[PDB]
Write a protein that holds these residues in place. Sequence first.
Motif, PDB file in Angstrom:
ATOM      1  N   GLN A  14       0.853  -1.182   0.000  1.00  0.00           N
ATOM      2  CA  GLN A  14       0.000   0.000   0.000  1.00  0.00           C
ATOM      3  C   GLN A  14       0.889   1.232   0.000  1.00  0.00           C
ATOM      4  OE1 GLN A  14      -2.804   0.205   3.226  1.00  0.00           O
ATOM      5  NE2 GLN A  14      -3.863   2.005   2.399  1.00  0.00           N
ATOM      6  N   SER A  16       0.731   5.445  -0.476  1.00  0.00           N
ATOM      7  CA  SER A  16      -0.112   6.634  -0.489  1.00  0.00           C
ATOM      8  C   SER A  16       0.775   7.861  -0.623  1.00  0.00           C
ATOM      9  CB  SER A  16      -0.963   6.717   0.780  1.00  0.00           C
ATOM     10  OG  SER A  16      -1.761   7.888   0.781  1.00  0.00           O
ATOM     11  N   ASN A  18       0.645  12.139  -1.210  1.00  0.00           N
ATOM     12  CA  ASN A  18      -0.150  13.359  -1.171  1.00  0.00           C
ATOM     13  C   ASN A  18       0.762  14.542  -1.451  1.00  0.00           C
ATOM     14  OD1 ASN A  18      -1.392  11.766   1.717  1.00  0.00           O
ATOM     15  ND2 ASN A  18      -2.444  11.759  -0.267  1.00  0.00           N
ATOM     16  N   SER A  42       4.058  14.103   0.933  1.00  0.00           N
ATOM     17  CA  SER A  42       4.128  13.031   1.918  1.00  0.00           C
ATOM     18  C   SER A  42       3.857  11.707   1.221  1.00  0.00           C
ATOM     19  CB  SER A  42       3.126  13.257   3.054  1.00  0.00           C
ATOM     20  OG  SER A  42       3.197  12.213   4.011  1.00  0.00           O
ATOM     21  N   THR A  44       3.978   7.482   1.871  1.00  0.00           N
ATOM     22  CA  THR A  44       4.056   6.387   2.830  1.00  0.00           C
ATOM     23  C   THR A  44       3.890   5.071   2.086  1.00  0.00           C
ATOM     24  OG1 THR A  44       1.692   6.578   3.313  1.00  0.00           O
ATOM     25  CG2 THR A  44       3.217   7.789   4.733  1.00  0.00           C
ATOM     26  N   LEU A  46       3.970   0.819   2.620  1.00  0.00           N
ATOM     27  CA  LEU A  46       3.908  -0.286   3.570  1.00  0.00           C
ATOM     28  C   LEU A  46       3.803  -1.594   2.801  1.00  0.00           C
ATOM     29  CD1 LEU A  46       3.589  -1.712   6.273  1.00  0.00           C
ATOM     30  CD2 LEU A  46       1.179  -1.031   6.285  1.00  0.00           C
TER      31      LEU A  46
ATOM     32  N   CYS B  17       0.724  -0.403  12.818  1.00  0.00           N
ATOM     33  CA  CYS B  17       0.414   0.504  11.723  1.00  0.00           C
ATOM     34  C   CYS B  17      -1.000   1.045  11.886  1.00  0.00           C
ATOM     35  CB  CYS B  17       0.550  -0.198  10.369  1.00  0.00           C
ATOM     36  SG  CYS B  17       2.185  -0.898  10.053  1.00  0.00           S
ATOM     37  N   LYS B  19      -3.931   3.890  10.124  1.00  0.00           N
ATOM     38  CA  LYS B  19      -4.343   4.690   8.971  1.00  0.00           C
ATOM     39  C   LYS B  19      -4.912   6.001   9.499  1.00  0.00           C
ATOM     40  CE  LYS B  19      -5.549   0.437   6.502  1.00  0.00           C
ATOM     41  NZ  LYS B  19      -4.286   0.438   5.713  1.00  0.00           N
ATOM     42  N   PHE B  26      -6.492  13.808   3.902  1.00  0.00           N
ATOM     43  CA  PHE B  26      -5.093  13.385   3.825  1.00  0.00           C
ATOM     44  C   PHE B  26      -4.950  12.110   4.648  1.00  0.00           C
ATOM     45  CE2 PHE B  26      -5.051  18.122   3.783  1.00  0.00           C
ATOM     46  CZ  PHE B  26      -4.782  18.281   2.439  1.00  0.00           C
ATOM     47  N   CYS B  27      -5.076  10.966   3.983  1.00  0.00           N
ATOM     48  CA  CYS B  27      -4.996   9.668   4.639  1.00  0.00           C
ATOM     49  C   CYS B  27      -3.642   9.025   4.370  1.00  0.00           C
ATOM     50  CB  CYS B  27      -6.118   8.745   4.161  1.00  0.00           C
ATOM     51  SG  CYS B  27      -7.771   9.248   4.691  1.00  0.00           S
ATOM     52  N   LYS B  28      -3.025   8.501   5.425  1.00  0.00           N
ATOM     53  CA  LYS B  28      -1.718   7.869   5.312  1.00  0.00           C
ATOM     54  C   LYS B  28      -1.604   6.752   6.337  1.00  0.00           C
ATOM     55  CE  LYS B  28       0.395  11.414   8.261  1.00  0.00           C
ATOM     56  NZ  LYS B  28       1.528  12.367   8.418  1.00  0.00           N
ATOM     57  N   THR B  29      -0.971   5.654   5.933  1.00  0.00           N
ATOM     58  CA  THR B  29      -0.729   4.510   6.810  1.00  0.00           C
ATOM     59  C   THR B  29       0.671   4.664   7.392  1.00  0.00           C
ATOM     60  OG1 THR B  29       0.184   3.075   5.094  1.00  0.00           O
ATOM     61  CG2 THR B  29      -2.210   3.154   5.321  1.00  0.00           C
ATOM     62  N   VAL B  30       0.742   4.954   8.689  1.00  0.00           N
ATOM     63  CA  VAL B  30       2.002   5.193   9.382  1.00  0.00           C
ATOM     64  C   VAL B  30       2.249   4.044  10.349  1.00  0.00           C
ATOM     65  CG1 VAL B  30       2.254   7.678   9.139  1.00  0.00           C
ATOM     66  CG2 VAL B  30       0.669   6.754  10.832  1.00  0.00           C
ATOM     67  N   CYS B  31       3.453   3.484  10.303  1.00  0.00           N
ATOM     68  CA  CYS B  31       3.844   2.378  11.163  1.00  0.00           C
ATOM     69  C   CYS B  31       4.917   2.837  12.139  1.00  0.00           C
ATOM     70  CB  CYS B  31       4.357   1.195  10.338  1.00  0.00           C
ATOM     71  SG  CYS B  31       3.186   0.591   9.102  1.00  0.00           S
TER      72      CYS B  31
END
Lengths: 50, 50
Positions: A14, A16, A18, A42, A44, A46, B17, B19, B26-31
Amino acid sequence: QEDHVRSSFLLDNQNSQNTVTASAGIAFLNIVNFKVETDYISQTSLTKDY
Amino acid sequence: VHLLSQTHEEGYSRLECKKKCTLKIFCKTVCEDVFRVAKAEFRAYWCVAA
């Protein structure tokens, strides 16, 4: 002879991204000039393996 | 009968992780990884004839 081989692979990815660019420029008759700009990027990524 | 109640601590690194969606657009998957030192209380007992 009896051989059972079971292989299971799973992969997920995945990504993303922006990008927001906001610029504003005002230029009067050589008397007032103001130019501004803002860039926000930004990304990201994964990856899940099994 | 209460035999022995003690505690045990162990440190482990957990990767999680999430979301996160800021401004609902502004959606992002951060781990992120957190090193947690978990402490658990173990109480062993024994059953004797009444």
